[PDB]
């Protein structure tokens with residue numbers, strides 16, 4: 001029992017995504033999230049590319065309901081922006097319109113990784129904008145819970161040239177050691193560890209903890225191979241982690257005696273007495289309560305040292321990275 | 328906790344604090360069929376229905392408040408004929424339950440709860456059984472989400488109230504009643520017209536007057552538009568007078584018949 005005049009009036013007025021946008025065979029990505037398309041306005045009062053996400057499943061899912069709820073309130077230059085929501089009544093599919101990010105850190109790093117067989121003005125700028133975006137979210141009690149290069153987008157040519165855009169779409173490379181020891185809850189510290197891993201990856205072009213129930217032995221073994229096994233003094237409440245007895249069963253301090261972040265970063269040509277390393281060490285702290293916060297990280301003298309970070313991460317240069325291939 | 332201190336940048340504040348004259352002008356559509364008095368009695372009735380649904384589903388009071396705002400927002404702009412409020416009420420609870428991260432209430436659990444609450448606690452108004460099925464809910468959810476402009480996060484007075492009484496150090500004496508008066512304001516238009524903190528202060532003032540606690544020195548020290556609080560207080564006092572004179576159980580069958588029913592298709 002719904003009013004007919006009300007029904008036909010809305011149906012008449014309702015903007016349909018197929019009518020407004022051209023996206024046929026422009027599928028930029030598929031995943032858990034759903035399908036993402038590089039789109040353009042058909043009624044050409046706009047020539048910027050837009051990212052257009054059809055959500056996985058039907059109807060207003062639990063996932064779909066949270067994404068819409070949060071992004072509709074969020075506004076910050078280093079966090080991805082929701083432009084419009086289309087509710088397609090026929091098939092009950094939900095569409096989400098975003099601005100289009102040409103690049104991301106997964107591809108940028110892989111490109112430099114291929115270039116062997118990464119400018120430090122860019123690195124500092126990348127890190128700063130990541131920390132600025134997370135500080136905004138953390139301030140609003142919004143955790144990311146899955147930070148990694150692929151989720152750190154970077155805008156291509158346009159009015160937002162080279163601005164970082166934090167986004168959110170089976171590897172444990174960026175996962176903090178407390179989660180690996182069975183931490184019940186996500187935290188702001190867990191996001192900071194992942195930022196530390198990324199910053200290590202930006203400097204070296206290598207994932208610092210590369211590898212491959214909550215417990216994961218070989219991933220822990222890699223962390224200790226790089227960081228060293230932590231002293232009781234370094235992380236006191238490690239004893240209170242649910243998987244501490246399993247850790248003590250499987251691992252021995254003696255194994256990682258000649259291991260440190262200093263020794264690791266020397267092997268990948270980064271000086272241990274640089275302001276960049278001392279910040280990295282403060283981000284990659286084993287004890288969650290001994291990691292600096294995103295606000296504190298932004299206040300590090302590293303960002304006052306030459307070269308200063310820039311709004312355009314690319315610093316006005318020609319961009320050597322290739323555009324997104326369609327799927 | 329998410330977006331806690333973002334009210335002045337939020338979609339609630341920027342889009343869903345409405346002008347009273349804009350609100351009353353849109354209401355004149357429905358006032359052809361109903362009295363001003365009778366329209367208010369519908370608001371109170373469906374506020375109780377939504378409360379009863381949330382209680383039956385063991386939902387927290389903040390989830391219930393959010394659902395009540397969604398309901399209020401929908402009919403603030405649109406007519407009572409457009410969608411049946413009997414359908415909209417449980418749809419609002421269903422949508423709010425997802426947003427506030429309790430869970431997707433089961434299809435069977437929602438429709439049983441909607442059937443049971445009306446059969447048990449509202450048989451005086453509704454003689455016939457709850458006719459709608461889960462496909463009607465899922466359709467209605469799309470219309471609701473669209474009209475609210477995807478604005479799902481809603482701020483409520485329970486948080487600022489809590490902070491205010493802790494500042495006073497009168498949590499044990501004042502919090503129960505003041506919290507209880509915050510619940511009653513959802514009978515009125517107040518949450519569409521004022522920020523949550525302003526309602527909370529008004530409720531706290533009435534709790535002080537009722538229990539004969541002096542807090543003028545406390546209230547005078549606050550940096551708020553104090554005349555705007557006296558508007559909210561006057562609405563709260565007027566509310567309890569309507570309560571006294573309103574017999575929901577004897578009146579609502581006749582008021583619900585006077586509602587404009589939806590036009591079916593040709």
Ligand SMILES: Cc1ccc(-n2nc(C(C)(C)C)cc2NC(=O)NCCN2CCOCC2)cc1
Nearest residue numbers: 029036053063064066067080144166167168169
């Ligand atoms: C269920 C759920 C899923 C995602 C979000 N979410 N959260 C974020 C934060 C606020 C953490 C930056 C962003 C998104 N969604 C997208 O960015 N979407 C844009 C689509 N992109 C993402 C990156 O990969 C390519 C497509 C919320 C809730």
